[PDB]
């Protein structure tokens, strides 16, 4: 097969700045008719891919001129000028000069906005969940940047590491932030043998953690 | 308007087979080939092959010969992909996509295939309301915890979609053959609890819809 190798894997770029990503092929991809059928697609989070560039350098219908493609031989480049928030997602190069058609491995474009601290909210187990014998404490850490963040759970002031499950959203195309959900799950029995439940969020935006807590004894 | 409409999500046991459909409308069905594309987490995008409805001619990625079979039925304007001898490696989102013209490239909405011996399990939907005695003005964040279901997908909306901004629905995570997902919504304090806030959870695999109104604790 024609192998397409994309670099970098991910690329943080601020709004208004230029992004440049490379696609390298394992062989020449000149079709028998003389054309080089290398394409660039953008797949935004949760959507199907959108075609940006075809035949190396031609802009597809409805694609702005700040997307430009170049290359020949085995080296191809997509340049994105004056990046906008809606440009985030995974960019793929693609070839149909040879069967089987193949995709590159993708390059994730990340919008580098100004740092933002999370809004943190803590939630005790629902009464419904307690009737099934389980107990989940949830902390949402919402609309922050950059993505890296650390959540520490404490039960009665002692750090708890077992039973934590964390999940991050994709980058938001409107405000360029991330959000994450942290769920600490215990049995109902163990939950009712303790008083205080705390999630502490440590983030680049401050040297002190953001602390949200509740006491079962209220 | 060109539309490709794919069949719903599927859970199939290893070793069995599945057939997925892609119904085309809004153009001359025999004029364009339809491709199938595999999107497996961690593995980018992969082209499987295409079928030309005009004459049922097919071109396959050699990797999927003996795995995928494409067929076409012009009288119903539908193409199909059948996958046999399924393994966990076949778990993926599968897209159909119509050969482009000058106006666009036309993708179906995708079909999520899970290959597993684990059992379909409906979700438990838990309301997330602030604890008693805390916070105040001027916004309030609520949520729903959707726990213990299998397989994917689950969809979550808030107030039947009327609440769309300020919503964060978090990707599900699989533990011990059951998924857990959560969704938060942030509204002005003047909205809740004065007006109703309800998370709507749908789990097609178990034929389940749950509405959970968020009530103060």
């Amino acid at each position: 097969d024609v192998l397409l190798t994309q670099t970098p894997l991910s690329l943080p770029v601020s709004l208004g700045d230029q992004a440049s990503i490379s696609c390298r092929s394992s062989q020449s991809i000149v079709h028998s008719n003389g054309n080089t059928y290398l394409e660039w697609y953008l797949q935004k989070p949760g959507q199907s891919p959108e075609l940006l560039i075809y035949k190396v350098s031609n802009r597809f219908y409805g694609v702005p001129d700040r997307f430009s493609g170049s290359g020949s031989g085995t080296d191809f480049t997509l340049k994105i000028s004056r990046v906008e928030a809606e440009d985030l997602g995974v960019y793929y190069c693609f070839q149909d000069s040879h069967i089987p058609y193949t995709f590159g491995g993708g390059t994730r474009l990340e919008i580098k906005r100004a740092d933002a601290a999370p809004t943190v909210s803590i939630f005790p187990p629902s009464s419904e969940q307690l009737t099934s014998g389980g107990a989940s404490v949830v902390c949402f850490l919402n609309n922050f940047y950059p993505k890296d963040i650390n959540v520490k759970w404490k039960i009665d002031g002692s750090e708890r590491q077992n039973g934590v499950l964390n999940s991050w959203t994709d980058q938001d195309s409107k405000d360029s932030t991330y959000s994450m959900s942290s769920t600490l799950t215990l049995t109902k029995d163990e939950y009712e043998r303790h008083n205080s439940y705390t999630c502490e969020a440590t983030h680049k935006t401050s040297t002190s953690p953001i602390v949200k807590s509740f006491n079962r004894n209220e | 308007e060109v539309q490709l409409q794919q069949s719903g999500p599927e859970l199939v046991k290893p070793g069995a087979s599945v057939k997925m459909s892609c119904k085309a409308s809004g153009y001359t069905f025999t004029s364009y080939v339809i491709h199938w594309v595999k999107q497996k987490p961690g593995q980018g995008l992969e082209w499987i092959g295409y079928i030309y409805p005009y004459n049922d001619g097919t071109i396959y990625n050699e990797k999927f010969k003996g795995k995928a079979t494409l067929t076409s039925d012009t009288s119903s304007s539908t193409v199909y992909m059948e996958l046999i001898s399924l393994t966990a490696e076949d778990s993926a989102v599968y897209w159909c996509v119509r050969e482009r013209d000058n106006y666009g490239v036309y993708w179906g909405q995708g079909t999520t295939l899970t290959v597993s011996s684990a059992k379909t399990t409906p979700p438990s939907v838990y309301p997330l309301a602030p604890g008693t005695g805390d916070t105040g003005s001027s916004m309030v964040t609520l949520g729903c915890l959707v726990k213990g279901y299998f397989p994917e997908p689950v969809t979550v909306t808030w107030n039947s979609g009327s609440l769309s901004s300020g919503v964060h629905t978090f990707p599900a995570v699989l533990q011990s053959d059951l998924y857990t997902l959560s969704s938060s919504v942030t509204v002005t304090s003047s909205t809740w609890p004065s007006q109703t806030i309800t998370c709507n959870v749908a789990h097609p695999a178990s034929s389940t819809k749950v509405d959970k109104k968020i009530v103060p604790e």
Partner: peptide
């Protein structure tokens, strides 16, 4: 000419 995506 390839049948494009």
């Amino acid at each position: 000419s390839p049948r494009h995506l």
